[PDB]
Amino acid sequence: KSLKAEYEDAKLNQTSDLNERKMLLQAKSLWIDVAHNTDACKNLENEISGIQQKVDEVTEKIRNRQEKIERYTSDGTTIEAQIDAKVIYVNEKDSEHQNARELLRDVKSRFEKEKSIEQIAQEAQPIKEQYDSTKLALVEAQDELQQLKEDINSRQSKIQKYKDDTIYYEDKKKVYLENIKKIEVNVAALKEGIQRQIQNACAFCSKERIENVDLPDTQEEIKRELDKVSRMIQKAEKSLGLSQEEVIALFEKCRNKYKEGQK
Amino acid sequence: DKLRKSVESLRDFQNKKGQLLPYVKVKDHKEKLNIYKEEYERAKANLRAILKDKKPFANTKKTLENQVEELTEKCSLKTDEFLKAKEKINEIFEKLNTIRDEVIKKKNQNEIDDQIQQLLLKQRHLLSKMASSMKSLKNCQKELISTQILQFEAQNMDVSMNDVIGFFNEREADLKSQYEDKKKFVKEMRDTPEFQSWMREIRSYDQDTKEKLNKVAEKYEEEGNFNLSFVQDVLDKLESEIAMVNHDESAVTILD
Amino acid sequence: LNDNPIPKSVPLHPKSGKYFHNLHARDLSNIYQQCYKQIDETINQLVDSTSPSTIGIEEQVADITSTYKLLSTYESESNSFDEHIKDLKKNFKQSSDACPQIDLSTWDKYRTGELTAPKLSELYLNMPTPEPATMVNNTDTLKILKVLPYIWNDPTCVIPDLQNPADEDDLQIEGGKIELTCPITCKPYEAPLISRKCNHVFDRDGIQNYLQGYTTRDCPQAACSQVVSMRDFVRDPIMELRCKIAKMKESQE
16 A cells, blocks of 8 residues: 555655646746736837827927918018008108199199180099099098008917917927827836746746646736645645655655556 | 545546636626716716816806897997098088188178188087097097907907817717716626626525535635636646546546 | 816917907107198198288197197107007917917916916006107297297397206297398398208308309308318208298298
């Protein structure tokens, strides 16, 4: 009976299989932990990509706003030059208005003195109609020459609004820069440590040799199994145990004893 | 040696109380129901508060729209009165020009002479009237600018409240998502996957003798809480620790 | 207290900023400039049309100069008010730069009562009075007016101390000892000019003949008979007004 128990141990057997199970379970738990960390890093870099798209649209808004601002600045410069030209034009047209008023009044006073020749008197009506038509047309022109000041005010307000939009876009750009900086610091710190976990897991058991076995990915089940196997191996050691080298020698000595006894 | 297996048969059979899984499931369902109920209460309170704030907010939106309309009407009125004052100024300037033209015409004609002095009396009075009326244009300018700059902050407030309304729209979208969360909580507490039925079955399998064992187990679970971890581990380990019995109650039976 | 449900203070949105930038006061200066030009021309033609035979011109000149002062004060108030409104807009925009964002928490805080972003109401409701100081007195029109008094007695004679600006309005105009004929052409100057340094009187033709060719020339009168540049000469209507007044007085009889 004793030899039967020794042989059953040889195939000690309980301790060996429990050790194999516990090392495999530790390797699988490390693999699951690093896989979950990698999934967290994937989520974080997906958030980074989303923030990068937000930053890209912010940058496109900034560049369109700034090109609009510079083109509107050039437009404002040319428009102010044009309104200065229109101001000198309206001044000289006002001088022409005064000249027309002068000649008009002169001919009107002249035929009054003549009464106090008829061809000269009827030749004034064309002058009067021309004078009044020109005066009305040039007053209408002066209307828009004044409205262009309101146009300048409107375009200046538009430029200021665009500048404020650019300022807000730059503010959100720097906010997003800080967000991505903190997120990349976090993922960096994670990777520093995730690499160490990968290395130690590979040292304990190769990644290919641990991915082949299929075990639940839930971390609660992994910890429960780890606790169960630890308690079972502790109980087995309490039932029987000795130095590791002694067990290594027994691995073969027990089988040798069994084979020699059987024969 | 068979006494060992004879004694350990009772230990192996003791695992039947593991029962324990229905009890842990019952407590889990109770806490889930409590969580769902408090979530429902919180969501309903939030929706009620946000709606009872929006409705006054809707009234404020309506009154702000009316104020914007009535202030734009006043803005048009101030511009109209400014334009009429400018027209009056132009009319008096035209009158001045006409009287000056008449003065020069009659002076040229002269070259009784009181026809000059009579119009010189009128021109000075007209100039004085123009000077006095310039006060009317000055007041129209000040009033006009003050009115526009005042009704402008009100419409700025209106647009800010519109932005707040958009934020409330986002918040009520979040509330609708919370309502969908309530719906999925209801679907979770369905307990149609063998729970209302499983418990009412197990707690009535034996209405005499066994009612006491499960009551005692429930009381023990409250004095000492053994979560699903204990259920999964110990219920099997109590017999798997030694795992060398062969569960041979027949061998123990032939002993006696 | 809640008072109106909308918070008394609220940050300014960029959309609101666009409209705020669109703000601009009406260009009343465009009308005031032409009011000034037309009152100037009406005054000049009135003084030209005055008949020397008429007696009792003091009251009308006093009334027109008072009107001139009144309208000048009104016009300067337009400048003061627009610079004040620009300052108020600057203050509002710089205060709105530090405003918080818009959210439910800010709405609750500013409706429950919190003096964080004051309105622009008080910025103009209790704004300090403009009180425009340094009343304008260098305007040519102001100098031209109020010269008619004390001119009928002896237009051809001008008091040497007339240049003193001690008088609140115009200058100390009274009789003196000066020749109404150009010292160059030896004839009355119908096209005179006045220097801005020596304040002499000449004829445009006489000065153009005594100075042209000689890039720099002197002045006939004492204390200025040294080579000077033509750039120290400007045009003032006062000499022409005096000449036309004298012409009318002479042609009256």
